[PDB]
Structure 1
């Protein structure tokens, strides 16, 4: 398998810092589809599909965030590609 589905969630100073826009820019550069979403607890989740290597690159960016973010904690999982998405959105 060359494709995967990734789920990731980050905590810390991760909302109001341009995080979703940052993830989207990187996802589009990497050819990844899915979305980034602000959650009510202050965390951000990302659901993404595409080449496993590209998803790993996107995860490295997710772990860092844009310069105004500070990611304190994360979790993530890679599972079977479902072919669910057509672009990369934010919510």
Structure 2
């Protein structure tokens, strides 16, 4: 058996801005709302700026464990619309948004 041991990965401080550019007919339907439920559940900040032009940008902001959860959610469970080409971009946070709301 083992003798040495170590632990790693626990929620502490800071979080990364996940830019998520969602394309397609995701306008109208509760796409940005669905992203809200999980984001809120997992303690994510940002804003879901559904400019009514097919191409809605989201500036969600997550840690690691909470990141992977909110990420794995979206792709796994697509919106109730014809998502055309959801091309997200892992970025970094300039600053934290005051909670997370939808346009």
What's the TM-score bracket when you normalise by the shorter of the two chains?
0.7 to 0.9
- TM-score normalized with structure 1 length: 0.77
> Are 1:18 and 1:66, in contact at CA under 8 Å, matched by a contact in 2?
no
**Greater per-residue helix proportion:** 1
User: Runs of 5+ in structure 2 lacking a partner?
Assistant: 1-12
Q: CA deviation at 1:17?
A: 1.0
Q: Which runs of 5+ in 1 are unaligned?
A: none
Greater Cα radius of gyration, structure 1 or 2: 2
Alignment of 1:89 onto 2:83: no
Displacement of 1:25 in angstroms is 1.0
- Determine which structure has the larger strand proportion and give its number: 1
Q: TM-score, normalised by structure 2?
A: 0.70
Matches of 1:67 and 1:78 in 2, distance apart?
20
Deviation at 1:56, TM superposition (A): 3.3
